[PDB]
Write a protein that binds this DNA or RNA. Structure first.
Ligand SMILES: [Cl-]
Ligand SMILES: [Cl-]
Ligand SMILES: [Mn+2]
Ligand code: NA
Ligand code: NA
Length: 325
DNA sequence: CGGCGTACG
DNA sequence: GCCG
């Protein structure tokens, strides 16, 4: 079992679901307290279990697994022995965890904002609605739409959204393409949002594209909220006899960068962090969603495919469905 | 012990 | 919290 998540296939569904979910609670709680190192270890330990070929049934099976030390092993031991880990359950029922989760789930609210509100004594969404002087326009939209945004986006919703995005993109720039990215490209059947990557086969033609796309979606009445090359929108999605609000991310990249943007926007989030960590620490190359830089030669690697990028990093290729770290 | 992804709005 |  290799130490980096980008070195091993991680399927969407696996054989250690309960154990990984427990460790991810502790990771999330660590993030709410600003403990980013402990968040990473618990995330990585959870991800290792996702990559295993069968269920962990005994503590000895953790021997030699990366990112399992005293703490993560004790969590697993307690779950194996009793079906519950007291620390995890303590976190789950705690007022701090529940409120930080509630608040950071709001579009426009991060950990720092949630924490300040928590310290001011705020606890519920209606507490926030009762003091709207303290909210940004983005937060106001996130609160207004919070119920709809809490409802899973389904794969059926995705195909409808892609068609309307392609229509606007085609008028904004004939020949431009729309690619589904994010969790749905990794095979997820539900999500929190839908992610699209837009490019054009003629380098440079994509410049200035996203404003033109957004203007056209707005004129079709499809945009409930928007604020360039990245857009974090709330879309009006038709429903039987009604509609619902859905978060949609639109991203534009030049075709020269498209493999890097596709890789970067297909995730998972942990997979990308691990991939960039691997690139820099093990290969001495700097990776982002625009390119891959050799800081000795001061040159950028040209990639024509995700396969190219995995090869340039010395990694076996993983299809999107195996990047569910 | 230092390090822990890396961008854009 | 864990790795190197
Ligand atoms: Cl930490
Ligand atoms: Cl980036
Ligand atoms: Mn998204
Ligand atoms: Na948020
Ligand atoms: Na997504």
């Amino acid at each position: 079992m290799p130490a980096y998540a980008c070195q091993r296939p991680t399927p969407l569904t696996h054989h250690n679901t309960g154990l990984s979910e427990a460790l991810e609670i502790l990771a999330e709680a660590a993030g709410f307290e600003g403990s980013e190192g402990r968040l990473l270890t618990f995330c990585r330990a959870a991800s290792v279990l996702k990559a295993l070929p069968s269920p962990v049934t005994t503590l000895s099976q953790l021997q030699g697994l990366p990112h399992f030390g005293e703490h993560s092993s004790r969590v697993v031991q307690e779950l194996l022995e009793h079906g519950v880990c007291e620390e995890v359950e303590r976190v789950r029922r705690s007022e701090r965890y529940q409120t930080m989760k509630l608040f950071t789930q709001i579009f426009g609210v991060g950990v720092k904002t949630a924490d300040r509100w928590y310290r001011e004594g705020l606890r519920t969404l209606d507490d926030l609605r009762e003091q709207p002087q303290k909210l940004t326009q983005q937060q106001k939209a996130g609160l207004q739409h919070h119920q709809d945004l809490s409802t899973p986006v389904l794969r059926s919703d995705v195909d409808a959204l892609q068609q309307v995005v392609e229509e606007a993109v085609g008028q904004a720039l004939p020949g431009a393409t729309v690619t589904l990215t994010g969790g749905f490209r990794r095979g997820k059947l539900q999500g929190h949002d839908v992610d699209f990557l837009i490019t054009h086969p003629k380098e440079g033609q994509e410049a200035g594209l996203l404003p033109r796309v957004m203007c056209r979606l707005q004129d079709q009445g499809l945009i409930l909220y928007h604020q360039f090359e990245r857009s974090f929108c709330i879309f009006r999605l038709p429903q039987p006899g009604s509609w619902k609000a859905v978060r949609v991310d639109l991203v534009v990249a030049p075709v020269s960068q498209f493999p890097f943007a596709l890789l970067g926007w297909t995730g998972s989030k942990l997979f990308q962090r691990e991939l960039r960590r691997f690139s820099r620490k093990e290969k001495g190359l700097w990776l982002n969603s625009h390119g891959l830089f050799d800081p000795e030669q001061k040159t950028f690697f040209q990639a024509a495919s995700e396969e190219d990028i995995f090869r340039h990093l010395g990694l076996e290729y993983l299809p999107p469905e195996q990047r569910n770290a």
